Structures are given as structure tokens and as C-alpha cells.
Amino acid sequence: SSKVSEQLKCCSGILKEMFAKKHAAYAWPFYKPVDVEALGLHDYCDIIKHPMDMSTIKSKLEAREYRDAQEFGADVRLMFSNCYKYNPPDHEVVAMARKLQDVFEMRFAKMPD
Numbered sequence: 001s002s003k004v005s006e007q008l009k010c011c012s013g014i015l016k017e018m019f020a021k022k023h024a025a026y027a028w029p030f031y032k033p034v035d036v037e038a039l040g041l042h043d044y045c046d047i048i049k050h051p052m053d054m055s056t057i058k059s060k061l062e063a064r065e066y067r068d069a070q071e072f073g074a075d076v077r078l079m080f081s082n083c084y085k086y087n088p089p090d091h092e093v094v095a096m097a098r099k100l101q102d103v104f105e106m107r108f109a110k111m112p113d
Ligand SMILES: CC(=O)N1CCN(Cc2cccc(C)c2)c2ccccc21
Pocket: 028, 029, 030, 033, 034, 035, 082, 083, 086, 087, 092, 093, 096
């Protein structure tokens, strides 16, 4: 029963939506950590210093590792920025990231006061 605890509940709701069937078409690459053993991803860890994904953010929320919504937000944006940094700007996964980020940014912006 506080301002910060209510906003963190909203964050959990936002992430739940991101995991929903509704967005699955473009959200799926962000579900689990980038598999750096996959062909073509041998250099991922050379380029991406701080990997992030939605399962990791979910575990961090559930282990209460986010002091506030801004910290949760930073991890969501890290995930997207990693995608934009690593992949070629014309790769389909970049388009998918933008589609999911549009969902996130709209919900995050309209979090209650
Ligand atoms: C999020 C991210 O940077 N990557 C790396 C590129 N990809 C590879 C890839 C290949 C075809 C279609 C798509 C949408 C994606 C990928 C795949 C599964 C999980 C993560 C990623």
C-alpha cells in the first residue's frame, strides 16, 4: 500500500501484456535470453555488454530487484536498445522490437499517479 508498490504492480501488468498471445507475433524473440550459441550470434557478447530479456525482467520483478518503475523501465529499454545496437537496422527483429516497444511505451506512459 504505497505509490511505489502500486507502480510496480502496474509494471508486472505491463510485462504480462507483453507476454500475451495478442502480441506474440512480434514479442517472441524477447521472451528468453539471446541464445549466444546460435549460428550467427557468436559475436553477441562482444557487442552486447548487458543482455536483457522479458523472462529475466519477470524474475527480477518477482525477486523485488526493482526499487521502482523507472528501474523496471530501464531494463525494458535495455532489452530494446540491445536489439537495435546488435542487429542490422533492416532486420525483421528490429521491426518486431519497435512494435513491442510501442506497446510498452504507451502503457508505461499512462501509469497512474
Ligand atoms: C532479440 C535479438 O536480438 N535476437 C537476435 C536475432 N534473432 C534472430 C532472428 C531470425 C529471424 C527472425 C527473427 C525475428 C529473429 C533472434 C532470435 C531469437 C531471439 C533473439 C534474437
